[PDB]
Amino acid sequence: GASKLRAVLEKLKSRDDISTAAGMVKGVVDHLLLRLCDSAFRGVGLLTGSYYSAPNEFDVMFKLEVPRIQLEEYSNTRAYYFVKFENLSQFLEGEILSASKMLSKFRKIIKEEIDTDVIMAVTLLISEISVDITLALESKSSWPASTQEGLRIQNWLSAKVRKQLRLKPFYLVPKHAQEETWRLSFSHIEKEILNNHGKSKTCCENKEEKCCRKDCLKLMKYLLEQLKERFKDKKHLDKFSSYHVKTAFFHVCTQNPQDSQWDRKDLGLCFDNCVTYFLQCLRTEKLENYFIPEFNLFSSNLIDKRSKEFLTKQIEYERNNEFPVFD
Amino acid sequence: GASKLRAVLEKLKLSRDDAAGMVKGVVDHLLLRLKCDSAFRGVGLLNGSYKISAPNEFDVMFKLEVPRIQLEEYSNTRAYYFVKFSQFLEGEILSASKMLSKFRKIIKEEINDDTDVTLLIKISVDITLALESKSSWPASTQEGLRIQNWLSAKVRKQLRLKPFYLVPKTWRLSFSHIEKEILNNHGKSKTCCENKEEKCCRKDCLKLMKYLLEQLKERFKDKKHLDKFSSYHVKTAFFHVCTQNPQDSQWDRKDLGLCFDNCVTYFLQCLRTEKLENYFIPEFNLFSSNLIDKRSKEFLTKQIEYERNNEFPVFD
Ligand SMILES: O=C(O)c1cccc(NC(=O)c2nnc(-n3cnnc3)[nH]2)c1
Ligand SMILES: [Zn+2]
Ligand SMILES: [Zn+2]
């Protein structure tokens, strides 16, 4: 029953509709970067606008190079940190850097340069299409000791690649934990190891090496969004996001490191295994962050078992009926 | 027969411990005095080590980013260029003679602060200055670096967005950085030579053919028939065979004897047909009659054919 999934893939490929709309966004973003003329946002750049069933919604991240940072871990929560440190000290509240103040001037300088308006990091609605903008510090120092045993790809993309990827800078993003904390972000690494997906360097570059990894992730996200929309009336699925399903997908990738276990003929079986693993994470309330292995996205402190037991029930019914949410 | 190949591969690994700290400190220190001068302000050694049977001889390159540069090719050579962009502009062109003189002059000054002058210390490291250009690579490289069936097209695109380097010789193309990259990341699989199940003999094949040429260059040191051949020819031919043999299973270290034989065979086909294209500039034949004459190739050919016919007595 894999043709119904490829029929979904066929309809999912809204290909030109996102291509023509991204040009309108490119102007707004390029017309946003010049105005942050600010001393505070001098070295601000971006991180190819992403688009996680909604071709009219975008999210771009604005990198801000911050040199000579030093991080204090919050409270054994290995993903949230305080930031310490030719000098810029407006938001420097004592020694910790005020995330709320630093985000306020970011919202302020952006609201000045903006049928384009702003909603309550930053979302806008141009020409009636929305763009989420995110502020991120860049630290070219070594990755925090909380990441050392994460990104277990040595058996899949090789240890030589993992050492190379950990040479790259990491990113911190304002995110409360109960406030004034920044969270570790490796979205750039996620982009890297998704477009260089295979164990073979020529994977998917020829008909004999066509795998179904990207297609499995796309259906995982599509399944979640469809059910997130179907049950919009209640809020049981509001705490789930495509970051969870893509983190689970990465754990299936390190579990099945060979390209032979991802042949496009076995798309139905491979996707069935991807759905099976995501359900196991739901029931056991365990899905470690791919880069911070001690950070549990599915801990009871973040999502309650009632909402996971609801998501599990919906997915189990879907798999047992050839996924009607696709119809 | 492959037992003898692994024997010299073993003896070639014991001569590696002796060593690279003295070379590293002197190259580090002299880079500070280079930033003293404005012309060398952005200068920087590019990755530190370097014949193979000569452990006391190194070769370093010094990258100095020259920006916003227009290259115009010297009369269809497709590999030598004039650098049209202020101490060394003879005309509208620059001058490697004036650049290297200012290089060798500034290089001379700092040295006198037990090292003579290529700086002999015993060991003697050779230094090379390279122009860096982050611009798109010249059109002569358009059909070179044919690795899309071996290391994929994505890797080829990623390598070509890296800068290309020019070296005084007119200035000639140099892709030594790209050579090292594909050498230590050599397999179709990313875990090639990283586990017991995916162990290839590509690197061993390159070391053997280099040791093959150097030893015969030493044996016939007086005949002057092989002094024009260099390890860059061996490595260039090795890359072509890697293109001809993309799959890692065609490089199983179970078949080191056959893999090395297939390497010397291709190298001999280049010597006989007098064609060895530059791996990056396919229209630049290193084995041309204007460079190496036929008598030298025929002598090198005959010497390798006898060697392979007798299980390489030079490897003793
Ligand atoms: O040109 C020759 O026939 C020749 C013969 C012997 C030695 C060298 N010189 C090098 O050691 C070299 N190292 N890289 C290159 N190279 C790069 N792209 N084209 C040539 N030559 C050149
Ligand atoms: Zn693939
Ligand atoms: Zn290998």
Q: Distance between termini of chain A?
A: 14 Å
Main structural class of chain A = alpha+beta
Please give the radius of gyration of chain A in angstroms: 21 Å
Order of helices and strands of chain A: HHEEEEEEHEEEHEEHHHHH
State the oligomer: homodimer
Bound molecules: the ligand O=C(O)c1cccc(NC(=O)c2nnc(-n3cnnc3)[nH]2)c1, zinc ion
Query: How many helical elements of chain A?
Result: 9
Number of domains of chain A: 2
Share of helical residues of chain A: 25-40%
What is the makeup of the main sheet of chain A? 9 strands, mixed
Q: Which chain pair shows the most residues in contact? A: A-B, 13 and 13 residues
Strand tally of chain A, please?
11
Question: How is the CATH topology of the largest domain in chain A named?
Answer: Poly(a)-polymerase, middle domain
Q: What is the CATH architecture descriptor of the largest domain in chain A?
A: Orthogonal Bundle
Write down the overall geometry of chain A. Answer: globular
PDB class: dna binding protein
Keywords: cGAS, Inhibitor, Complex structure, DNA binding protein
Assembly: dimeric
Entry title: Human cGAS catalytic domain bound with compound s2
